[PDB]
Write a protein that binds this DNA or RNA. Structure first.
Length: 160
RNA sequence: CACA
């Protein structure tokens, strides 16, 4: 399940109370405790929809202790392989346009739309190879398209 | 992005 969050760029004194308040104010229920490490934390959301809401609501927007939080899907390093999620896709971007960006970095084995509350669209992309997805992620992350900037992140690749 |  993609309900597990990574909370990056935390300050040297962000504690679970601080994270609890951020998710409380953002009205993101969490399904377990915040595990705070050194400059980063983890938390589970009740389901995939709530985790994505936290990412879209908080990641790069919410400032804790004068630092913008990163809030992304927690992906084990060894599972950063073929699969990306792409957020902040323009609401009325035709699939063929998105596909013509995607295929510039490899073979797309699958591109699935993810139901989202926001007006932007979200897709999970699976590339043929680890290399293709890393090129997609480096090149598509930050790409500005129809008044929006793509956010591209790994999602777990458990089958490669 | 967890691992004495």
């Amino acid at each position: 399940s993609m309900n597990k969050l990574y909370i990056g760029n935390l300050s040297d004194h962000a504690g679970p109370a601080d994270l609890e308040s951020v998710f409380k104010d953002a009205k993101i229920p969490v399904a377990g405790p915040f595990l705070v490490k050194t400059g980063y934390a983890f938390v589970d959301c009740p389901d995939e929809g709530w985790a994505l809401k936290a990412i879209e609501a908080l990641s790069g927007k919410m400032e804790l202790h004068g630092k913008p939080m990163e809030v992304e899907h927690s992906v084990p390093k060894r599972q950063r392989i073929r699969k990306l999620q792409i957020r902040n896709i323009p609401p009325h971007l035709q699939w063929e346009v998105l596909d013509s960006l995607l295929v510039q970095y490899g073979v797309v084995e699958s591109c699935e739309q993810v139901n989202t509350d926001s007006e932007t669209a979200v897709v999970n992309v699976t590339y043929s190879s680890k290399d293709q997805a890393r090129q997609a992620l480096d090149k598509l992350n930050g790409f500005q398209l129809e008044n929006f900037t793509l956010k591209v992140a790994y999602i777990p690749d458990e089958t490669a």
